Amino acid sequence: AKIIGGFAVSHTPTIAFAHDANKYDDPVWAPIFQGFEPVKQWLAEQKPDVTFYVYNDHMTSFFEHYSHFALGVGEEYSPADEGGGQRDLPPIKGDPELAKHIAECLVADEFDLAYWQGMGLDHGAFSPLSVLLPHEHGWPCRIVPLQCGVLQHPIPKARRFWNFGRSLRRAIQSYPRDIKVAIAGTGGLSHQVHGERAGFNNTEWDMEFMERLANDPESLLGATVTDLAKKGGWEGAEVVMWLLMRGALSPEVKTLHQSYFLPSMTAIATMLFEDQGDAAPPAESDEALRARAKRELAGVEEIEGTYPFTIDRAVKGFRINHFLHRLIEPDFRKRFVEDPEGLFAESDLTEEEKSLIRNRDWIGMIHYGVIFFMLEKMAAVLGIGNIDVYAAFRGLSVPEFQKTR
Amino acid sequence: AKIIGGFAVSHTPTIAFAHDANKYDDPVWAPIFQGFEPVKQWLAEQKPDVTFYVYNDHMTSFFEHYSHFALGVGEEYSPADEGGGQRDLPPIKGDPELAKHIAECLVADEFDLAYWQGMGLDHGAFSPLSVLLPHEHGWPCRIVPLQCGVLQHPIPKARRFWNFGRSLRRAIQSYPRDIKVAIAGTGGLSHQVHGERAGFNNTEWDMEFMERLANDPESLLGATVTDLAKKGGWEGAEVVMWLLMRGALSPEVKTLHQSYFLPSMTAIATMLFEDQGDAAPPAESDEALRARAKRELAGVEEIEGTYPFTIDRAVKGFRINHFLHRLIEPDFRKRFVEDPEGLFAESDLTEEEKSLIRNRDWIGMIHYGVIFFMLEKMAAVLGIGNIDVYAAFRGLSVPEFQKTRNAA
Ligand SMILES: [Fe+2]
Ligand SMILES: [Fe+2]
Prior knowledge:
Chain A is an alpha/beta fold. Chain A has helices at about 15-20, 30-45, 95-110, 125-130, 160-175, 205-215, 225-230, 240-245, 285-295, 310-315, 320-325, 330-340, 340-345, 350-360, 360-370, 370-380, 385-395, 400-405, and strands at about 1-10, 50-55, 65, 70, 75, 90-95, 115, 140-150, 180-185, 255-260, 270-275. In chain A, strand 10 (about 255-260) and strand 11 form a beta hairpin. The termini of chain A are far apart. In chain A, about 55% of the residues are buried. Chains A and B meet through strand 3, helix 3, strand 7, helix 7 and helix 11 of A and strand 3, helix 4, strand 7, helix 8 and helix 12 of B. The site of one fe (ii) ion has 6 residues of chain A, from loops.
């Protein structure tokens, strides 16, 4: 519940390439890597427990279903295959409890979210993170990723991103755990990688944007996509993500560091902002905001025989829900009926999970965190009528259940 | 541009099952099917060009990535396999133009959205549609589906569904085509299908909800999920979608019809609302709304050598983008290098799309509507450097391009 600060950093895969290829001595990449050194050192000293990490995915894990603010709620994340294979980094751990609380608060403030788990993190995350955090033998902190749908227009207005950040600050602060959180905003700066204009950069704009972001972010809140794209190249307009992160910080920040390099296509920039705490007590106390986040499901526990599918439950049941979800695939469901144990062998299911499935333990699966609609697919595939399922939920025989109807 | 009205209907698959089993003469299902008739008739008599269709997916097309407001922007939608194979129905056409305009308005209004194409529409849509619309060869109308994430909490507050509906009205009215649009709100009423409370119904609440939704919907806006779930069952709380629909209609509506039946687990209910138009001018004019929705990209066409990836272009380039996106799959990208022609013959690519790929025509693909990040995958898979692609964009040799850079 303490925001220690935030950093802003370009997320080109060229950073990951140079790092993987060992260009720390290279005459071009040496000073660029030295540019990352202050942020890297700050993260090592401050030791944040979680980084809330704002990035965009590059038509890898988000494509056919493309959302504006997608909050990663899962247990851990690994590098996505981008068409080159999986980068050899270990999985970074998520923070499901922080994510849930943040989701509860953001929805209370009327932002519309997406929740995701299990999918790979593209270079949007692992490019800068592999250069800013040691990862030889695990990552030093947890991640709550927020993927922003900045590529398919219309996208949220610059001000919406900023307001997200403002509500995000309160959500993190009001989290009832004594932890240190860093906010990251990635992408940028100026660049365009498509069309006859590919190669566009604007260093004057980059330096102005950075100063405005640091010392007067509200001045940027009326900038349109057109403004940002004219000034910064089409893809450079992703810097609205920097605004989101900047919105999560104290109104006044100390800029501990700024660097800037432009070897190729992308202005590779980094910014380190030290949070200054709060000058005045916030407009609504942490206690009050907590009760507001809780309002919708307050007293749901008094509704007996009911297992709300909350984020915690989704995370708990993810493996088994994911497994059962595959019953929509003709080949998978046919194997499910013909050779379920071979299927169980190849899966990541735990032994209770398999046994729940084995025993057709309907109620036990609901207790466990299987969502009903995945059970329904399992029943239908097995030629078992839903009424059999409902009767078992009630611990009744079918004719007994039928009578109550 | 004209909202003619709305209909509310349960979307239980049991409706589809009864229809497909031909239970129109069943002593239980005859009156129930008679209950859909006024809506069927209204639809056939009114002939909306488009139905904006509010449903929820039942963990089929939306699972690992679960959004609150998912707008379907695609050209068409096929029934989803829900574990029992694909139902035998023709594809329903989408409306990418109206969805793009709606997207632009809702975002101008600070609603955070999702866009989706190509995935199956499940029974939430096809159960009640198959019963309400004739479909022997095609469908009478286009559809803009809005899939709402009502199943994984936290979900948007009831007031947010309603405010979504309020902005949706202005979004549709300001659409600059002279077309008729119906709005469908689906799901409910009372039921609970999981846990020891499974089997719960509340006809008293169901009737009260219908009365309030028709005549005092604003009285509903403060309802918490807890309150809705106690009254209507855990899954009966999906009725927030009826709120969204109702919010898109005129403040006062004419209730042309309502029915209610409870043969099994789910209260099967239908409501038909006739829009009464607007009594006052809207706070903001259509002309001004159109201007505000165009604001973010106004003047973009003056930026040379730039091809914004907007909804119309995402729809256009879908098949080729979907194809190249498959290059993240090990087996697929192997076949792409080793045997592309066999891959093309299995694909739904048009000949010119295959040709663009065959020729490694980077700028052509960009003009055509492939997004850069799919080309980047094709390039890398093929051992082609990004610099070669940028140079081809610029019409320059690789070293003349490299010269524009500060370092190679
Ligand atoms: Fe990016
Ligand atoms: Fe539903």
